[PDB]
Amino acid sequence: TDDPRLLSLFSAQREEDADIVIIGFPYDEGCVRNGGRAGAKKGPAAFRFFLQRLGSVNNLELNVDASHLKLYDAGDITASTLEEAHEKLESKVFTVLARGAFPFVIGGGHDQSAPNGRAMLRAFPGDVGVINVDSHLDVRPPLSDGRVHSGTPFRQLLEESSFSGKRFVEFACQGSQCGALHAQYVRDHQGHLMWLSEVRKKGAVAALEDAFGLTGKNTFFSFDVDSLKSSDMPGVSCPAAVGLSAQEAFDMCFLAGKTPTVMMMDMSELNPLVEEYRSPRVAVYMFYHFVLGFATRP
Amino acid sequence: TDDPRLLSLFSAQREEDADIVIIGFPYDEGCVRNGGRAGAKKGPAAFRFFLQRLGSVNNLELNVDASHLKLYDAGDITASTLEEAHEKLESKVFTVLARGAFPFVIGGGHDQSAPNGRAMLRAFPGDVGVINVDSHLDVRPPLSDGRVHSGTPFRQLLEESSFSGKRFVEFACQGSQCGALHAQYVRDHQGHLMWLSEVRKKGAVAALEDAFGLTGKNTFFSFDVDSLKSSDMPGVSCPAAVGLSAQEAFDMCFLAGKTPTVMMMDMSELNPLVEEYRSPRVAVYMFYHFVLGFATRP
Amino acid sequence: TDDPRLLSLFSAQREEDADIVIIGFPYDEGCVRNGGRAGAKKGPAAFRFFLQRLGSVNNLELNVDASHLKLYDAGDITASTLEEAHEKLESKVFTVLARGAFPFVIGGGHDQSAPNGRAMLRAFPGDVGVINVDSHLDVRPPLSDGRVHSGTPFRQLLEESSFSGKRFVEFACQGSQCGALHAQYVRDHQGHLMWLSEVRKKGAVAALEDAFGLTGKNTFFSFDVDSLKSSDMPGVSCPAAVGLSAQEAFDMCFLAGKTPTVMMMDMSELNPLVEEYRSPRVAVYMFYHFVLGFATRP
Ligand SMILES: [Mn+2]
Ligand SMILES: [Mn+2]
Ligand SMILES: [Mn+2]
Ligand SMILES: [Mn+2]
Ligand SMILES: [Mn+2]
Ligand SMILES: [Mn+2]
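Output (structure tokens, whole complex):
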């Protein structure tokens, strides 16, 4: 009515006409394999519910009007197996990238970041950066019989010959939850560990600016919502005791939105089975702040 | 026993003998009409439950003894319809005001602020100020067939010929939740928008002091508890992702209590159906801090 | 596997070989007597569940490796009555103390602090300090017929002829929840009240350093988890509206761990019946930070 919100930006009767394309990845098998609580497969549905409801397109507090932006919802990736789902996701994200549009993928388990990253490495050969905003490092080895999971995505991206580890940042990781062997693996690959305490000392936005300085061009902004403290964000498989505040997350997403080198974003681990109302709202508000930032891109 | 609390201040065998009169407004129809989650009609009952239990009358941390104050509970406004409830509420609040006592009204939906404001405009003709502490602006148009709701109260107060909009402050409003047309309406009426980010930058108490400077004499302190972050205050119809902390709310209520130009207060949107224990406790602690501040008035 | 955590430190096939001994006190009768919500008797079980799961032994964010430490779980104190449970607890804690090891007692209600303190007063005659980290003072009188409870433990320790009250600190107590008569009793005994607002002004670690300066040698670090804000720590009998953050608690426990004069610790009021997942995790992370600090002791 007299209060236009995100829903209103879905004007693009055709996908190729949209600045931003939302893709859903409703799988949590990766999570279960990594010993996590099931439920993240309901993330895309919960995200969509509040997507229809939240976020003033013209925000007079930040003074950003996102009216001119065109969003499109490409629906969910559908497949018979997780492994087939990954392939279709990678293929889909690539095509959006290839024609210069911005894919935003709502999961679902963090395993989605492997295919998403692969789509990046193909769209921008030898020139990709990646930041993982996560309380965890997610460079865990695969299952004994080779199966991937919510904890392996950045092991398989660091194993990519075309990817420079100097351009990988683990952001807001927590020492109480990250093993020395996994930190060692990241650092040995020249990756950067920006611990939660360091982010908090610098300020989250300032720290993220530093991170983006390291990631450089063609950055994949990968956000695991279990990097947020569970007081603000309880609805995840691995709820954090300490972590980023909702405001820090909003501010970070806004920065990512305005940063022209950020070429795609995913958001993983939203788990409506754990908490179904407050948390999906935070997730949608995070995307909302990204949208506002993106609205300021030249 | 050896630990006197708020309950003990209810010594006034007669209402006219009390410094502060609590009035309950157990209605949430306004909320439902504004598309909100039902439940706020249980606010007064939940507030009363903890009112019997909380708040040391002599607080050695703040060094304020509220022993001398007399409180009285006038019970709930009872009526057959919301619209009749409003009239009785306005009439009741006026009489408390007219004899120089302080009415505190616990709701219930924020629609109560319309009658409460009217009672103010009558008690202090042409000389009223009003602050709305709210994540939302609440200047929404009425329903298509004229019905009021939890989102219209300040549209109907700004429409009052005796009220100066230069003396209206929307405090801790959130740009992600406030439409440009509603901000426009407030500003066009010379009202003041103090966004959450501005309150946080200044500090909540300092910002509230600034607000009171603008509201001036005969201020109505209207508090929508959905201005608090839902980590602290989950039990409301529209839970906030970001917002005021419990401590900021306590500090603000204490300031309002000590500020002699603050002539009445209401508290709206408490919803025990959403969360029944933590949230009513916060509401009672907010009133408690107001009481302590009031105890320091000359 | 390739990620060793607290569980791995339980190598000591014999108790006397451990640096730190965990003792469980699964009783909440003290709580119920003090008018509290039952459930804290499940604390030790919930604490143990996450003890098996959390806390990287080598923490690269703090740069502390706790690999060298040996922990042992002595199980629960078992008895037919609360009063017999207290005696066995005191006896057990004393023996651990007497041979120079560190007892950590997970409750259970805060009444455990009476026997724990007595074990201290015996192990270090006339030379004990005590800090109570608690939103409440816990110097309440016994029941009319003499029965103790979760609110009396520090009344019975201040009544100890061998204990100097100048070396007792009530840390992070809240004026809204502490009666003037109880504050009076503490101060009259030369005890120190460090209100939450003062702790927050100074910073929690700095304030705790000050407290330890007052407690001196042979300090008993007694932590009531209801000193934490219920946004972070909801699973307690008396949830706090405001209070210490999880991070402040972690930081405080780390300091206690590294402070050589801290000779034992207890943790009380964890109530899985109120909230069963987030809160026990916080409790285990608190112990985890203590362990890390202890790992740095000369
Ligand atoms: Mn994670
Ligand atoms: Mn992850
Ligand atoms: Mn509101
Ligand atoms: Mn409102
Ligand atoms: Mn306590
Ligand atoms: Mn206690």
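Residues B 110, 134, 136, 138, 224, 268 surround manganese (II) ion (ligand 4) (CB under 6 Å).
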